[PDB]
């Protein structure tokens, strides 16, 4: 299970 | 830039051995089957970004809305400053990695 980014959009 | 038959880890190794910094691809989501995910290489490492398909548009669970995945990919390719993570660090879609 890979890393997913937390985006500020 | 769409790789229909690869996992997140395979995407990482593909980007690290055949791509450069700024290379990216799109692939189907393991955790949200039926949806898609961007894998993006920056500073020698690879991160991943879920793409939301509501049936009325695509987006990145926030931000501008798009009619098609391709329009989404095209938009961030052309707008390198728009994918800021909460850290404040930008993540740039620069070079699509072909199949």
Swiss-Prot record, chain A:
It comes from the Eukaryota. The chain holds residues 624 to 632 of 694 of the full protein. It comes from Homo sapiens. Phosphorylated in response to FGFR1 activation. Phosphorylated on tyrosine residue(s) by the epidermal growth factor receptor (EGFR) and the insulin receptor (INSR). Tyrosine phosphorylation of GAB1 mediates interaction with several proteins that contain SH2 domains. Phosphorylated on tyrosine residues by HCK upon IL6 signaling. The modification Phosphotyrosine is found at residue 4. Identified in a complex containing FRS2, GRB2, GAB1, PIK3R1 and SOS1. Forms a tripartite complex containing GAB1, METTL13 and SPRY2. Within the complex interacts with METTL13. Interacts with GRB2 and with other SH2-containing proteins. Interacts with phosphorylated LAT2. Interacts with PTPRJ. Interacts (phosphorylated) with PTPN11. Interacts with HCK. This is GRB2-associated-binding protein 1. Adapter protein that plays a role in intracellular signaling cascades triggered by activated receptor-type kinases. Plays a role in FGFR1 signaling. Probably involved in signaling by the epidermal growth factor receptor (EGFR) and the insulin receptor (INSR). Involved in the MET/HGF-signaling pathway. Transmembrane segments: none annotated. Belongs to the GAB family. The gene is GAB1. It is linked to Deafness, autosomal recessive, 26: A form of non-syndromic sensorineural deafness characterized by prelingual, severe to profound hearing loss. Sensorineural deafness results from damage to the neural receptors of the inner ear, the nerve pathways to the brain, or the area of the brain that receives sound information.
From Swiss-Prot, chain B:
Residues 1-97 form the SH2 domain. Widely expressed, with highest levels in heart, brain, and skeletal muscle. It is found in: Cytoplasm; Nucleus. It comes from the Eukaryota. Changing residue 64 to K: In JMML; also in myelodysplastic syndrome. The modification Phosphotyrosine is found at residues 57, 61. Phosphorylated upon activation of the receptor-type kinase FLT3. Phosphorylated upon activation of the receptor-type kinase PDGFRA. Phosphorylated by activated PDGFRB. Interacts with phosphorylated LIME1 and BCAR3. Interacts with SHB and INPP5D/SHIP1. Interacts with MILR1 (tyrosine-phosphorylated). Interacts with FLT1 (tyrosine-phosphorylated), FLT3 (tyrosine-phosphorylated), FLT4 (tyrosine-phosphorylated), KIT and GRB2. Interacts with PDGFRA (tyrosine phosphorylated). Interacts (via SH2 domain) with TEK/TIE2 (tyrosine phosphorylated). Interacts with PTPNS1 and CD84. Interacts with phosphorylated SIT1 and MPZL1. Interacts with FCRL4, FCRL6 and ANKHD1. Interacts with KIR2DL1; the interaction is enhanced by ARRB2. Interacts with GAB2. Acts downstream of various receptor and cytoplasmic protein tyrosine kinases to participate in the signal transduction from the cell surface to the nucleus. Positively regulates MAPK signal transduction pathway. Dephosphorylates GAB1, ARHGAP35 and EGFR. Dephosphorylates ROCK2 at 'Tyr-722' resulting in stimulation of its RhoA binding activity. Dephosphorylates CDC73. Dephosphorylates SOX9 on tyrosine residues, leading to inactivate SOX9 and promote ossification. Dephosphorylates tyrosine-phosphorylated NEDD9/CAS-L. Belongs to the protein-tyrosine phosphatase family. Non-receptor class 2 subfamily. It is linked to LEOPARD syndrome 1: A disorder characterized by lentigines, electrocardiographic conduction abnormalities, ocular hypertelorism, pulmonic stenosis, abnormalities of genitalia, retardation of growth, and sensorineural deafness. Noonan syndrome 1: A form of Noonan syndrome, a disease characterized by short stature, facial dysmorphic features such as hypertelorism, a downward eyeslant and low-set posteriorly rotated ears, and a high incidence of congenital heart defects and hypertrophic cardiomyopathy. Other features can include a short neck with webbing or redundancy of skin, deafness, motor delay, variable intellectual deficits, multiple skeletal defects, cryptorchidism, and bleeding diathesis. The SH2 domains repress phosphatase activity. Binding of these domains to phosphotyrosine-containing proteins relieves this auto-inhibition, possibly by inducing a conformational change in the enzyme. This is Tyrosine-protein phosphatase non-receptor type 11. The chain holds residues 6 to 104 of 593 of the full protein.
């Amino acid at each position: 299970q890979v890393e997913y980014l937390d985006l500020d959009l | 830039w769409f790789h229909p038959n690869i996992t997140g880890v395979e995407a990482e190794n593909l980007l690290l051995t055949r791509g450069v910094d700024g290379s990216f691809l799109a692939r189907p989501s393991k955790s949200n089957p039926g949806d898609f995910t961007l894998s993006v290489r920056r500073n020698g490492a690879v991160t991943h970004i879920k793409i939301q398909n509501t049936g009325d548009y695509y987006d990145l669970y926030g931000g501008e809305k798009f009619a098609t995945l391709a329009e989404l990919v095209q938009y961030y390719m052309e707008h390198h400053g728009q994918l800021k993570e909460k850290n404040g660090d930008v993540i740039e879609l620069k070079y699509p990695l072909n199949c």
